[PDB]
Amino acid sequence: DARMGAEAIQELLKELDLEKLERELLEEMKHPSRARRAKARKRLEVVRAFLDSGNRPEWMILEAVPVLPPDLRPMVQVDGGRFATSDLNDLYRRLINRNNRLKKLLAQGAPEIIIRNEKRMLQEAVDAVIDNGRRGSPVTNPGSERPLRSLTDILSGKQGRFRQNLLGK
Amino acid sequence: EKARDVKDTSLRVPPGEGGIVVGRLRLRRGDPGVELKPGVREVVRVFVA
Amino acid sequence: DQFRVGLARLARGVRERMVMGSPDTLTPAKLVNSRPLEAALREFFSRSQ
Amino acid sequence: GKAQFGGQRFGEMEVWALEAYGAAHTLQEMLTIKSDDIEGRNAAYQAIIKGEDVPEPSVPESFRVLVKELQALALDVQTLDEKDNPVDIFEGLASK
Amino acid sequence: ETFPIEEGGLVLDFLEYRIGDPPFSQDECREKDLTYQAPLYARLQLIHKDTGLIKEDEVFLGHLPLMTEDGSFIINGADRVIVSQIHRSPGV
Amino acid sequence: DPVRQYLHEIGQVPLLTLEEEIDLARKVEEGMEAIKKLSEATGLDQELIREVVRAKILGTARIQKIPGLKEKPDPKTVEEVDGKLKSLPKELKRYLHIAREGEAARQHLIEANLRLVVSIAKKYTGRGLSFLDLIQEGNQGLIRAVEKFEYKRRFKFSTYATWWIRQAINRAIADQARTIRIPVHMVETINKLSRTARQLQQELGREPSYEEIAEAMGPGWDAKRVEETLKIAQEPVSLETPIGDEKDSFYGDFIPDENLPSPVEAAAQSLLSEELEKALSKLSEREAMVLKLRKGLIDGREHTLEEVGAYFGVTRERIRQIENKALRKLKYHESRTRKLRDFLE
Amino acid sequence: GDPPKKDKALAYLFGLLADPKRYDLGEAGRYKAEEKLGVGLSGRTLVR
Amino acid sequence: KKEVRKVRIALASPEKIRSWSYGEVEKPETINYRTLKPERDGLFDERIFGPIKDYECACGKYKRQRFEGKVCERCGVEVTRSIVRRYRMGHIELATPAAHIWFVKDVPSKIGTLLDLSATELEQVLYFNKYIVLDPKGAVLDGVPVEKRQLLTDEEYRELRYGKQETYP
DNA sequence: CTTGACAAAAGTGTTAAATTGTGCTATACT
DNA sequence: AGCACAATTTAACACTTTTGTCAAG
Ligand SMILES: [Zn+2]
């Protein structure tokens, strides 16, 4: 089983035993060398976070897509006859396009090559709708300039909603 | 007074620019040497001094 | 500076509209384009610094 | 700007300035009643028009946006109350 | 620089460019919300590396904005300005 | 890196010359006819067992396990078809392998011509798809041209494929690009018109006019039909488009909210909802409670005269006069108190 | 990205240097740089 | 109904996300080019994201406050205020399971230190450029039998699952 | 507060005109 | 880029019902 991409990661992340790894790391902490010991510390911090929060790590690999309400990033016309749309909208659009075409290829029985191509384009589009440009060159409006502002792109930055809106308005 | 089909639209004057009208510039769709936006009717740009 | 790059952007649009259609005799009129150059110049004449 | 016909900005520096003196409710109005808060800003005009005191705000509505915004990233926004218990941010809204 | 545009192939070369006459005077543009621009025609010849077809035709480019007397242009009725850019001269 | 990715993935597997090509197509058609042959074996549709081949070929558990919450599950609607034709003599069990190898050879020939499909979508860029998209849908067009191809006709598959790739691409254009859904024919006519314009522009040495451009378009083409749909064509506008020349200003931040009634309207409306309640009490217990039922004031839905007269025991006529008189009788109180005389908009 | 073909490096790299149309070394650059280093560079190119 | 003095934040699960959603938007069509109304599956859909007009459903089978909350049986639109369109979320059922870029490109690299991997190597994996081992099944590799938590490549995987072979023209 | 009579507004149904969604095109073309 | 054609939607239209109204009770 060589499974590549998110699928495999989902399976293994699911298989994880929080407790066992915990004890193992605890013993690994007593290692005399600062390397194994530091590693054990800095690593176990994560496992610990999971053990306490009771949140399962496999959740990191998501099957559903938390799609923000429509009126939170609408498309509304203005005076003059032309409409106006948010950036996250077109982002979500590319996301579902790849998502559907992928299914189309799946049931189709298409060969492995095409599969990996679209199946990967899924991870890149999806992750682009979350943080656009933290991995690889950002995606911009077709043929123009300004990189679509994704979810994580609205939060951070000096104009982040935490600042331009909620810590001052 | 019935609620009539058409409601007021017309462009008033800004709160703090009191002028006097000078330039009366009308541009109707269908006139020589004027090409308006795709599917718009007559416009007007009035000057206020 | 924008005339040149904005012309090259049409140079490729010329070399592409060649490899197909009717290679026998195509007047350069069907070969050349307007927008790839025009819009490329207007770009600098409006939205530049 | 005077163009769109709107009020000035209370951005973080101003907020801190208020926190300094210690004016709490003054900051409340800023973050809610006199700014964004949905039923709040209306209840204000209601009160003042009726010659009374405006009720204390609840939902800033900008924050309400932030809630679902985070949720879009699969960030469970859990609002607690006075002792580790559920709270309905969006009044009777998304409760499915 | 951008010529000849080559590709049994095509040698389309450059010949000239007709200086356009302003369609609308700098006034008309300022009151029409139109840019002060003139059609810049272009003349060239399409030839073939084999057929020897010398077929020539005067094509057309687009509309190029024109400068006023003072040194400012007219963009959509709003006159604008092109300032100067600075940087170390090319070289070594 | 996704760009280099596909290129280096397809560059791994070579192409196919006439030998391999003709052979592969023959294999595929043999598998197909083998399926049709076994379609009478147990009485299963030619498409049924066809996909039943996929169960053990291009994935074991991954083809039917998640086409949504429901599809054709491995244990239920699949397994009884996998172990059904599984007991048949030689003259049947052989067509199984014919279908196995045909089905594989299909995907094979596809992979072989992939190095073409990509080199095809290269011209079709600028459609609102940066390469990889175009290529994907093109690959779909290949899959189509594959099962529809016929080697017997002595045609090079590179010719048959291209015409389908260009199709699945030029189709994907209208179903992707414009944020607003624009039906195929719409875009078709768009490109037609814009082609004519972008053509006679150089001809006339200037831009056309809605009358002269639509003129060369055909019948029923006036200034309207072109200028009208011209609006439709135009895509929406990114709210992140900077306004002015300074780096602060956003587009979206420049749009109002009229969706929710403004506070001034909260009080403006809540005022009338009351002031009409106090100026109402001067009406008889009939002509008031009835005067509400005709305005949708009571249950919020309007109650026609016919029903009101049924509620009070009166007739479809009496309520009619009741409303008239009761109403103007209030007009006197209004014109004498000036309490409500506003709200005239 | 592109395969290490012997003809690709004949075209690309060439177009980056000896090509006055893809490399415009300003008349100043072809001038100023010309009188420092003690040389005769002809075109606006780098190599020939 | 209760004084809110506390607000937590944590990870969400595919199930919880499924719950947040009122339906799965599919079609890329934002809104019609004609009716400019929310499409059947449109991102801005009014069918499951709630009405744009208070209490007025799409078709208008229920146009008033009178019938409150009653789900429309004709056009499929729950009668309520247009505010729900700003809160009620949605979701997309992703064909193949996919991950979240955050935990990946993050500074401590959550998933990485989690499963005990490195940003680079795990990157090759998640993005479908490189296979990884799950239960090798006794598979030998270059004298060292491959084991779980290891990485493979396009060739070797086939050379193991489909066997090695050479070609001689 | 009421009856019969009756225009206009509104309703139920079929068909025509319009709109919209799909499938194909084979010299060869990687 | 262009096209024939099936699938729906929308529009035109034929006619019944409801509701509002006039004059007299
Ligand atoms: Zn309804």
Coordinates of all heavy atoms in Angstrom, one line a residue, chain A residues 71 75 82-87 90 93-94 97-98 101 105 107-121 141-142 146 149 159, chain F residues 5-6 9 51 54 58 62 106-107 111 114 128-130 132-133 136-137 140 143 147 176-177 179-180 234 236-241 248 250 259:
Chain A
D71 N -24.5 35.6 1.9 CA -24.6 37.1 2.2 C -23.4 37.6 2.9 O -23.3 38.8 3.1 CB -25.9 37.3 3.0 CG -26.5 38.7 2.7 OD1 -26.5 39.1 1.5 OD2 -26.9 39.4 3.7
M75 N -22.8 39.0 -4.2 CA -22.6 39.6 -5.5 C -23.7 40.5 -5.7 O -24.9 40.1 -6.0 CB -22.4 38.6 -6.7 CG -22.1 39.3 -8.0 SD -22.9 38.6 -9.4 CE -22.2 36.9 -9.5
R82 N -23.6 47.3 -13.9 CA -22.7 46.2 -13.8 C -22.6 45.7 -12.4 O -22.8 46.5 -11.4 CB -21.3 46.5 -14.3 CG -21.3 47.1 -15.7 CD -20.1 48.0 -16.0 NE -19.0 47.2 -16.6 CZ -17.9 47.8 -17.1 NH1 -17.7 49.1 -16.9 NH2 -16.9 47.1 -17.6
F83 N -22.4 44.4 -12.2 CA -22.4 43.8 -10.9 C -21.0 43.8 -10.2 O -20.1 44.3 -10.8 CB -23.0 42.4 -11.0 CG -24.5 42.3 -11.1 CD1 -25.1 42.8 -12.3 CD2 -25.3 41.8 -10.1 CE1 -26.4 42.7 -12.4 CE2 -26.6 41.8 -10.3 CZ -27.2 42.2 -11.4
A84 N -21.0 43.3 -9.0 CA -19.7 43.3 -8.3 C -19.6 42.0 -7.3 O -20.6 41.8 -6.6 CB -19.5 44.5 -7.5
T85 N -18.5 41.3 -7.4 CA -18.4 40.1 -6.6 C -17.1 40.0 -5.7 O -16.1 40.5 -6.1 CB -18.5 38.8 -7.5 OG1 -18.6 37.6 -6.7 CG2 -17.2 38.7 -8.3
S86 N -17.2 39.3 -4.6 CA -16.1 39.0 -3.7 C -15.1 38.1 -4.3 O -15.4 37.4 -5.3 CB -16.6 38.5 -2.4 OG -15.8 39.0 -1.3
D87 N -13.9 38.1 -3.8 CA -12.8 37.2 -4.3 C -12.9 35.8 -3.9 O -12.7 34.8 -4.7 CB -11.5 37.8 -3.8 CG -10.8 38.8 -4.8 OD1 -11.5 39.1 -5.8 OD2 -9.7 39.2 -4.5
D90 N -15.2 33.5 -6.5 CA -14.5 32.8 -7.6 C -13.6 31.7 -7.0 O -13.4 30.7 -7.7 CB -13.7 33.8 -8.4 CG -14.6 34.8 -9.1 OD1 -15.1 34.5 -10.1 OD2 -14.7 36.0 -8.7
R93 N -15.5 28.8 -6.4 CA -16.0 28.3 -7.7 C -15.0 27.3 -8.3 O -15.3 26.2 -8.6 CB -16.2 29.5 -8.7 CG -16.7 29.0 -10.0 CD -17.7 30.0 -10.6 NE -17.2 31.3 -10.9 CZ -16.3 31.6 -11.8 NH1 -15.8 30.6 -12.6 NH2 -15.8 32.8 -12.0
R94 N -13.7 27.8 -8.3 CA -12.7 26.9 -8.8 C -12.6 25.6 -8.0 O -12.5 24.5 -8.6 CB -11.3 27.6 -8.8 CG -10.2 26.8 -9.3 CD -8.9 27.6 -9.4 NE -8.3 27.5 -10.7 CZ -8.8 28.0 -11.9 NH1 -9.9 28.7 -11.9 NH2 -8.1 27.8 -13.0
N97 N -15.5 23.3 -9.1 CA -15.2 22.8 -10.5 C -14.3 21.6 -10.4 O -14.6 20.5 -11.0 CB -14.6 23.9 -11.3 CG -15.7 24.7 -12.0 OD1 -16.3 24.3 -12.9 ND2 -15.9 26.0 -11.6
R98 N -13.1 21.8 -9.8 CA -12.2 20.6 -9.7 C -12.8 19.5 -8.9 O -12.6 18.3 -9.3 CB -10.9 21.0 -9.0 CG -9.8 21.4 -10.0 CD -9.9 22.9 -10.5 NE -8.8 23.3 -11.3 CZ -7.6 23.6 -10.8 NH1 -7.3 23.5 -9.5 NH2 -6.6 23.9 -11.7
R101 N -15.4 17.7 -11.5 CA -14.7 17.0 -12.6 C -13.9 15.8 -12.1 O -13.8 14.8 -12.8 CB -13.7 18.0 -13.2 CG -13.0 17.4 -14.4 CD -12.2 18.5 -15.1 NE -11.5 19.3 -14.1 CZ -10.8 20.4 -14.4 NH1 -10.8 20.9 -15.6 NH2 -10.2 21.1 -13.4
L105 N -14.4 11.9 -13.4 CA -13.3 11.1 -13.8 C -13.3 9.7 -13.1 O -13.0 8.7 -13.6 CB -11.9 11.8 -13.6 CG -11.7 12.9 -14.6 CD1 -10.6 13.8 -14.0 CD2 -11.5 12.5 -16.0
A107 N -15.9 7.7 -11.4 CA -16.9 6.7 -11.9 C -16.6 6.3 -13.3 O -16.8 5.2 -13.7 CB -18.3 7.3 -11.7
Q108 N -16.0 7.3 -14.1 CA -15.7 7.1 -15.5 C -14.7 5.9 -15.7 O -14.8 5.2 -16.7 CB -15.0 8.3 -16.0 CG -14.5 8.2 -17.4 CD -15.6 8.2 -18.5 OE1 -16.4 9.1 -18.4 NE2 -15.6 7.3 -19.4
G109 N -13.8 5.7 -14.7 CA -12.9 4.6 -14.8 C -11.6 5.1 -15.4 O -10.7 4.3 -15.9
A110 N -11.4 6.4 -15.5 CA -10.2 7.0 -16.1 C -8.9 6.5 -15.5 O -8.9 6.1 -14.3 CB -10.3 8.5 -15.9
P111 N -7.8 6.5 -16.3 CA -6.5 6.0 -15.9 C -5.9 6.8 -14.7 O -6.3 7.9 -14.5 CB -5.7 6.1 -17.1 CG -6.2 7.3 -17.8 CD -7.7 7.1 -17.7
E112 N -5.0 6.1 -14.0 CA -4.3 6.7 -12.8 C -3.7 8.0 -13.0 O -3.8 8.9 -12.1 CB -3.2 5.7 -12.4 CG -3.2 5.4 -10.9 CD -2.8 6.6 -10.0 OE1 -1.7 7.1 -10.2 OE2 -3.6 7.0 -9.2
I113 N -3.0 8.3 -14.2 CA -2.4 9.6 -14.5 C -3.4 10.8 -14.3 O -3.1 11.7 -13.5 CB -1.8 9.6 -15.9 CG1 -0.6 8.7 -16.1 CG2 -1.4 11.0 -16.3 CD1 -0.9 7.2 -16.1
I114 N -4.5 10.7 -15.1 CA -5.5 11.8 -15.0 C -6.0 11.9 -13.6 O -6.2 13.1 -13.1 CB -6.7 11.5 -16.0 CG1 -6.2 11.1 -17.4 CG2 -7.7 12.6 -16.0 CD1 -7.3 10.7 -18.3
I115 N -6.2 10.8 -13.0 CA -6.6 10.7 -11.6 C -5.7 11.6 -10.7 O -6.2 12.5 -10.1 CB -6.7 9.3 -11.0 CG1 -7.8 8.5 -11.7 CG2 -6.9 9.3 -9.5 CD1 -9.1 9.3 -11.8
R116 N -4.4 11.2 -10.7 CA -3.5 12.0 -9.8 C -3.5 13.4 -10.2 O -3.3 14.3 -9.3 CB -2.1 11.4 -9.9 CG -1.8 10.2 -9.0 CD -0.3 9.7 -9.1 NE 0.6 10.8 -8.8 CZ 1.8 10.9 -9.2 NH1 2.3 10.0 -10.0 NH2 2.6 11.9 -8.8
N117 N -3.7 13.7 -11.5 CA -3.6 15.1 -11.9 C -4.7 15.9 -11.3 O -4.5 17.0 -10.6 CB -3.7 15.2 -13.4 CG -3.5 16.6 -13.9 OD1 -2.6 17.3 -13.5 ND2 -4.3 17.1 -14.9
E118 N -6.0 15.5 -11.4 CA -7.1 16.2 -10.9 C -7.2 16.1 -9.3 O -7.5 17.1 -8.6 CB -8.4 15.7 -11.5 CG -9.6 16.4 -10.9 CD -10.0 17.7 -11.6 OE1 -9.1 18.4 -12.1 OE2 -11.2 18.1 -11.6
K119 N -6.9 14.9 -8.8 CA -6.9 14.6 -7.4 C -5.9 15.5 -6.6 O -6.2 15.9 -5.5 CB -6.6 13.1 -7.2 CG -6.7 12.6 -5.8 CD -6.6 11.1 -5.8 CE -5.2 10.6 -6.4 NZ -5.2 9.2 -6.7
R120 N -4.9 15.9 -7.3 CA -3.9 16.8 -6.7 C -4.4 18.3 -6.9 O -4.3 19.1 -6.0 CB -2.5 16.6 -7.4 CG -1.5 17.7 -7.0 CD -0.2 17.5 -7.8 NE -0.4 17.3 -9.2 CZ -0.5 16.1 -9.8 NH1 -0.3 15.0 -9.0 NH2 -0.6 15.9 -11.1
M121 N -4.9 18.6 -8.1 CA -5.5 19.9 -8.3 C -6.6 20.2 -7.3 O -6.9 21.4 -7.0 CB -6.1 20.0 -9.7 CG -5.0 20.0 -10.8 SD -5.7 19.3 -12.4 CE -6.4 20.8 -13.0
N141 N -7.3 36.7 -10.1 CA -8.4 36.8 -11.0 C -8.0 36.5 -12.5 O -6.9 36.9 -12.9 CB -9.1 38.1 -11.0 CG -10.5 38.1 -10.3 OD1 -11.5 37.6 -10.9 ND2 -10.5 38.6 -9.1
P142 N -8.8 35.7 -13.2 CA -8.3 35.2 -14.5 C -7.8 36.3 -15.4 O -8.5 37.3 -15.6 CB -9.5 34.6 -15.1 CG -10.3 34.1 -13.9 CD -10.1 35.2 -13.0
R146 N -4.7 41.2 -9.1 CA -4.9 41.1 -7.6 C -5.3 39.7 -7.2 O -6.3 39.1 -7.6 CB -5.9 42.2 -7.1 CG -7.4 41.8 -6.8 CD -8.2 41.5 -8.1 NE -8.1 42.6 -9.0 CZ -8.8 42.7 -10.2 NH1 -9.7 41.8 -10.4 NH2 -8.7 43.8 -11.0
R149 N -8.5 37.1 -2.2 CA -8.3 37.1 -0.8 C -9.1 35.9 -0.2 O -10.3 36.0 -0.3 CB -8.7 38.4 -0.2 CG -7.8 39.0 0.9 CD -7.9 40.5 1.1 NE -9.3 40.9 1.1 CZ -10.0 41.0 2.3 NH1 -9.4 40.7 3.4 NH2 -11.2 41.4 2.2
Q159 N -5.2 45.1 8.0 CA -6.6 45.4 7.7 C -7.5 44.2 8.1 O -8.7 44.2 7.8 CB -6.8 45.7 6.2 CG -6.4 47.1 5.9 CD -6.9 47.5 4.5 OE1 -8.1 47.4 4.2 NE2 -6.0 47.8 3.6
Chain F
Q5 N 4.8 19.2 -12.8 CA 4.3 17.9 -12.4 C 3.7 17.1 -13.5 O 4.4 16.1 -13.9 CB 3.1 18.1 -11.4 CG 2.5 16.9 -10.8 CD 3.2 16.3 -9.6 OE1 3.4 17.0 -8.6 NE2 3.5 15.0 -9.6
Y6 N 2.6 17.4 -14.0 CA 1.9 16.7 -15.1 C 2.9 16.4 -16.3 O 2.9 15.3 -16.8 CB 0.7 17.4 -15.6 CG -0.2 16.5 -16.4 CD1 -0.7 15.3 -15.9 CD2 -0.6 16.9 -17.7 CE1 -1.6 14.5 -16.7 CE2 -1.4 16.1 -18.5 CZ -1.9 14.9 -17.9 OH -2.7 14.1 -18.7
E9 N 5.2 13.8 -15.5 CA 4.4 12.5 -15.3 C 4.1 11.8 -16.6 O 4.2 10.6 -16.7 CB 3.1 12.8 -14.5 CG 3.4 13.4 -13.1 CD 2.1 13.5 -12.3 OE1 1.1 14.0 -12.8 OE2 2.1 13.0 -11.1
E51 N -18.5 -1.7 -16.4 CA -18.0 -1.1 -15.2 C -17.6 -2.1 -14.1 O -16.7 -1.9 -13.3 CB -19.0 -0.1 -14.6 CG -18.5 0.5 -13.3 CD -18.9 2.0 -13.1 OE1 -20.1 2.3 -13.2 OE2 -18.0 2.8 -12.9
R54 N -14.0 -2.5 -13.9 CA -13.3 -1.5 -13.2 C -13.0 -1.9 -11.7 O -12.1 -1.4 -11.1 CB -14.1 -0.2 -13.2 CG -14.6 0.2 -14.5 CD -13.5 1.0 -15.3 NE -14.1 1.4 -16.6 CZ -15.1 2.3 -16.8 NH1 -15.6 2.9 -15.7 NH2 -15.5 2.6 -18.0
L58 N -8.8 -0.5 -12.3 CA -8.2 0.8 -12.1 C -8.4 1.2 -10.6 O -8.0 2.3 -10.2 CB -8.7 1.8 -13.1 CG -10.0 2.5 -13.1 CD1 -11.2 1.7 -12.6 CD2 -10.0 3.9 -12.4
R62 N -11.5 1.6 -4.5 CA -11.7 3.0 -4.6 C -12.6 3.6 -5.7 O -12.8 4.8 -5.8 CB -10.3 3.6 -4.8 CG -9.6 3.1 -6.1 CD -8.1 3.5 -6.1 NE -7.9 4.9 -6.6 CZ -6.7 5.5 -6.7 NH1 -5.6 4.8 -6.2 NH2 -6.6 6.7 -7.2
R106 N -7.4 0.4 -23.3 CA -8.1 1.7 -23.4 C -7.3 2.8 -22.7 O -6.8 3.7 -23.3 CB -9.5 1.6 -22.9 CG -10.4 2.9 -22.9 CD -11.6 2.7 -22.1 NE -12.1 4.0 -21.6 CZ -12.8 4.1 -20.5 NH1 -13.1 3.1 -19.7 NH2 -13.1 5.3 -20.1
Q107 N -7.3 2.6 -21.4 CA -6.5 3.6 -20.6 C -5.1 3.8 -21.1 O -4.6 4.9 -21.1 CB -6.5 3.1 -19.1 CG -7.7 2.4 -18.6 CD -9.0 3.2 -18.9 OE1 -9.1 4.4 -18.6 NE2 -10.0 2.5 -19.4
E111 N -3.3 7.3 -22.1 CA -2.0 7.8 -21.5 C -1.0 8.1 -22.6 O -0.2 9.0 -22.5 CB -1.5 6.7 -20.6 CG -2.4 6.3 -19.5 CD -2.1 4.9 -18.9 OE1 -1.0 4.7 -18.5 OE2 -3.1 4.1 -18.9
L114 N -1.9 11.4 -24.2 CA -1.9 12.5 -23.2 C -0.9 13.6 -23.5 O -1.2 14.8 -23.4 CB -1.7 11.9 -21.8 CG -2.9 11.4 -21.1 CD1 -2.6 11.0 -19.7 CD2 -4.1 12.4 -21.2
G128 N -9.6 31.7 -18.8 CA -9.9 31.8 -17.3 C -9.5 30.5 -16.7 O -9.9 30.2 -15.5
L129 N -8.6 29.8 -17.3 CA -8.0 28.5 -16.9 C -6.5 28.6 -17.1 O -6.1 28.7 -18.3 CB -8.7 27.3 -17.6 CG -10.2 27.0 -17.4 CD1 -10.5 27.1 -15.9 CD2 -11.1 27.8 -18.3
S130 N -5.7 28.5 -16.1 CA -4.3 28.5 -16.3 C -3.9 27.1 -16.6 O -3.7 26.3 -15.6 CB -3.5 29.1 -15.1 OG -2.2 29.5 -15.5
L132 N -3.4 23.7 -16.5 CA -3.8 22.4 -15.9 C -5.3 22.1 -16.0 O -5.7 21.0 -16.2 CB -3.4 22.4 -14.5 CG -2.0 22.0 -14.0 CD1 -0.9 23.0 -14.3 CD2 -2.0 21.6 -12.5
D133 N -6.1 23.2 -15.8 CA -7.6 23.0 -15.9 C -7.9 22.6 -17.4 O -8.5 21.5 -17.6 CB -8.3 24.4 -15.6 CG -7.8 25.0 -14.3 OD1 -6.6 25.3 -14.2 OD2 -8.6 25.0 -13.4
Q136 N -6.9 19.2 -18.1 CA -7.9 18.2 -17.5 C -9.1 17.9 -18.4 O -9.4 16.8 -18.7 CB -8.3 18.7 -16.1 CG -7.7 17.9 -15.0 CD -8.0 16.4 -15.1 OE1 -9.1 16.0 -15.4 NE2 -6.9 15.6 -14.9
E137 N -9.8 19.0 -18.7 CA -11.0 18.8 -19.5 C -10.7 18.3 -20.9 O -11.5 17.5 -21.4 CB -11.8 20.2 -19.6 CG -12.8 20.4 -18.5 CD -14.0 19.4 -18.6 OE1 -14.8 19.5 -19.6 OE2 -14.1 18.5 -17.7
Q140 N -10.6 14.8 -20.7 CA -11.9 14.2 -20.8 C -12.3 14.1 -22.2 O -12.8 13.0 -22.6 CB -12.9 15.1 -20.0 CG -13.4 14.5 -18.7 CD -14.3 13.3 -18.8 OE1 -14.5 12.5 -17.9 NE2 -14.8 13.1 -20.1
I143 N -10.8 11.0 -23.5 CA -11.6 9.8 -23.1 C -12.8 9.6 -24.0 O -13.1 8.4 -24.3 CB -12.0 9.9 -21.6 CG1 -10.8 10.0 -20.7 CG2 -12.9 8.8 -21.2 CD1 -11.1 10.0 -19.2
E147 N -13.3 6.0 -26.8 CA -14.4 5.0 -27.0 C -15.2 5.3 -28.3 O -15.9 4.4 -28.7 CB -15.3 5.0 -25.8 CG -14.7 4.4 -24.6 CD -15.2 5.0 -23.3 OE1 -16.4 4.9 -23.0 OE2 -14.4 5.6 -22.5
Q176 N -17.2 27.6 -17.2 CA -16.3 28.0 -16.2 C -16.1 29.5 -16.1 O -16.4 30.1 -15.0 CB -14.9 27.4 -16.4 CG -13.9 27.7 -15.4 CD -13.8 26.7 -14.3 OE1 -13.8 25.5 -14.5 NE2 -13.8 27.3 -13.0
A177 N -15.6 30.2 -17.2 CA -15.1 31.5 -17.1 C -15.9 32.6 -16.5 O -15.5 33.1 -15.4 CB -14.8 31.9 -18.6
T179 N -18.2 34.4 -14.1 CA -18.7 34.2 -12.8 C -20.2 33.9 -12.8 O -20.7 33.0 -12.2 CB -18.4 35.3 -11.9 OG1 -17.2 35.9 -12.2 CG2 -18.4 34.9 -10.4
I180 N -20.9 34.7 -13.7 CA -22.3 34.5 -13.9 C -22.5 33.4 -15.0 O -21.8 33.4 -16.0 CB -23.1 35.8 -14.3 CG1 -22.3 36.5 -15.5 CG2 -23.2 36.7 -13.2 CD1 -23.0 37.6 -16.1
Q234 N -20.5 40.9 -20.0 CA -19.6 41.5 -19.0 C -19.7 40.8 -17.6 O -20.8 40.7 -17.0 CB -19.9 43.0 -18.8 CG -19.8 43.8 -20.1 CD -19.2 45.1 -19.9 OE1 -18.0 45.2 -19.5 NE2 -19.9 46.2 -20.1
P236 N -18.7 40.0 -13.5 CA -18.8 40.8 -12.3 C -17.4 41.5 -12.0 O -16.5 41.4 -12.8 CB -19.1 39.8 -11.2 CG -19.9 38.8 -11.9 CD -19.2 38.6 -13.2
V237 N -17.4 42.1 -10.9 CA -16.2 42.9 -10.5 C -15.7 42.6 -9.1 O -16.4 42.6 -8.2 CB -16.4 44.4 -10.6 CG1 -15.2 45.2 -10.1 CG2 -16.8 44.9 -12.0
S238 N -14.4 42.2 -9.0 CA -13.8 41.8 -7.8 C -13.9 43.0 -6.8 O -13.5 44.1 -7.1 CB -12.3 41.5 -8.0 OG -12.2 40.5 -9.0
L239 N -14.4 42.7 -5.6 CA -14.6 43.7 -4.5 C -13.2 44.1 -4.0 O -13.2 45.0 -3.2 CB -15.4 43.1 -3.4 CG -16.9 42.7 -3.7 CD1 -17.6 42.3 -2.5 CD2 -17.6 43.8 -4.5
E240 N -12.2 43.5 -4.4 CA -10.8 43.8 -3.9 C -10.1 44.8 -4.9 O -9.0 45.2 -4.7 CB -10.0 42.6 -3.8 CG -10.2 41.8 -2.5 CD -11.7 41.4 -2.2 OE1 -12.4 41.1 -3.2 OE2 -12.1 41.5 -1.0
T241 N -10.9 45.2 -5.9 CA -10.3 46.2 -6.9 C -10.1 47.5 -6.2 O -11.1 48.2 -5.8 CB -11.3 46.4 -8.1 OG1 -11.4 45.1 -8.8 CG2 -10.7 47.4 -9.1
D248 N -5.0 52.0 0.1 CA -5.8 51.8 1.3 C -7.1 51.3 0.8 O -7.5 50.1 1.1 CB -6.1 53.1 2.1 CG -6.9 52.9 3.3 OD1 -6.4 52.1 4.2 OD2 -7.9 53.5 3.5
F250 N -10.6 50.1 -0.7 CA -11.1 48.8 -1.3 C -12.4 49.1 -2.0 O -13.1 50.1 -1.8 CB -11.3 47.8 -0.2 CG -10.2 46.8 -0.1 CD1 -10.0 46.0 1.0 CD2 -9.4 46.5 -1.2 CE1 -9.0 45.1 1.1 CE2 -8.4 45.6 -1.1 CZ -8.2 44.9 0.1
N259 N -30.0 46.2 2.6 CA -30.7 44.9 2.8 C -31.5 45.0 4.1 O -32.7 44.6 4.2 CB -29.6 43.8 2.9 CG -28.7 43.8 1.7 OD1 -28.4 44.9 1.2 ND2 -28.3 42.6 1.3

